[PDB]
Amino acid sequence: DTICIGYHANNSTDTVDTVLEKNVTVTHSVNLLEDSHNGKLCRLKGIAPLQLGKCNIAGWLLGNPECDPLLPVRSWSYIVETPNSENGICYPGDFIDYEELREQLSSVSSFERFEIFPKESSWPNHNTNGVTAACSHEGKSSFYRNLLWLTEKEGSYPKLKNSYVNKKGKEVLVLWGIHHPPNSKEQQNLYQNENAYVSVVTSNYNRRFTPEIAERPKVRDQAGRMNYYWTLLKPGDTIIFEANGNLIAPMYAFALSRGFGSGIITSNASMHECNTKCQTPLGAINSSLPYQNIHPVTIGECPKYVRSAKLRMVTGLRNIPS
């Protein structure tokens, strides 16, 4: 009679690397590197993302007419722009502190779009009809839905002064614009005052704008320029507009709510009826795995992104079915 001590083997084809060796075949092992996603945009912890569609943050907040109008109130877990950012700024110029506003929006959980200065009542003795071929809609000249081009009425541009008090109990994002004509004749025609100014003031914002007249190269057929400005009006605070020309007045503004764990991503992927704890621009991950090589851009509670092709840890022993 004989008695023997020995160890398990099986049909396992799993391989791992060690420091001393590699392509070591082992009885049992566990994958730590998640490489599988579902290729869909999904709800995050029950809340759908904001899809800007043919629009970029700039087009959306200014209200570029080519962009399909969103609901007056929305909430989201994250913001999706598309690689095809076709509709942004339509009238050429600079969006001042644009990157800072995007960073501000990264921590915003919802908005109410509301009529801050009603078109009919807010601007007596000025024309509000101003449109441009640079901001086209269905072939017709149009303008931003959230701004208003104030021009002369019956040969006069009276000095205007209007203020709004924030009784929304939320930060209110107000945007406006300053128009810079290419020459002194257009300035005269639109605003009459050759030496016009614009002032915008709050408790913690104070800025004066003076037009800069010059023949510039044509951009979307305009030699003129429009600079775009914004501020966050604190709850209870007042914003005051004074102008004797060149003001692209606010009409609609946004009451913002702040939330946690949001961001802006760019994605080719489509919204599906799904829910996830972890979203990437490529698709959602459903994993208790510690690492992933799918994408460095993550929303939610995700594995740590690494460049690795494989991370496999051995649990069994050297498999030798000999």
Partner: protein, 171 residues
């Protein structure tokens, strides 16, 4: 095989043994069979299960981590942001890869340890009442049975019972 047991003096594994990583093969008048040592095997599972859990627990959830944008005149801050993202990623890839490599080496060596320790435990239990006959096998100088085999596997083997008989047999 750091301890020379696995892929060493025991050249192969037993595909026939499906109920644990380590254990016993017996051959006697009544027949032959395999049986895992549950104590050494279960302890080995607990250890490895605690080691996998440790690696995962230490790698904490990644929270929302997204790109930033920079204007034509913020190339330095854009470059700085990239250096920070790239730098962290270089570090984490390296940390992850070495940790699995180091632990894998430690793991194989650990299984090798468990085989050597179980062999020595039974060999030292059986003592001179059987002979070591190579490839981690003992050949008995006396008759052994299911009761005998069960008593040896669970570390309850008696020397006096077979001391005289083996001695007569061993010559």
């Amino acid at each position: 095989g750091l301890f020379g047991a696995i892929a060493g003096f025991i050249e192969g594994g037993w595909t026939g043994m499906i109920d644990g990583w380590y254990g016993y093969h017996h051959q006697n008048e009544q027949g032959s069979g395999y049986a895992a040592d549950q104590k050494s095997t279960q302890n080995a599972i607990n250890g490895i299960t605690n080691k996998v859990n440790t690696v995962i627990e230490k790698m904490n959830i990644q929270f929302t981590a997204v790109g930033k944008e920079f204007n034509k005149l913020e190339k330095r801050m854009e470059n700085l942001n990239k250096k920070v993202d790239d730098g962290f990623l270089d570090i984490w890839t390296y940390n992850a890869e070495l940790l699995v490599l180091l632990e894998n080496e430690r793991t194989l060596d650990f299984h090798d340890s468990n085989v050597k320790n179980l062999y020595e435990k039974v060999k030292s239990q059986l003592k001179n009442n059987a002979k070591e006959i190579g490839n981690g096998c003992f050949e008995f100088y006396h008759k052994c049975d299911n009761e005998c085999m069960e008593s040896v596997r669970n570390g309850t083997y008696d020397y006096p019972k077979y001391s005289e008989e083996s001695k007569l047999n061993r010559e």
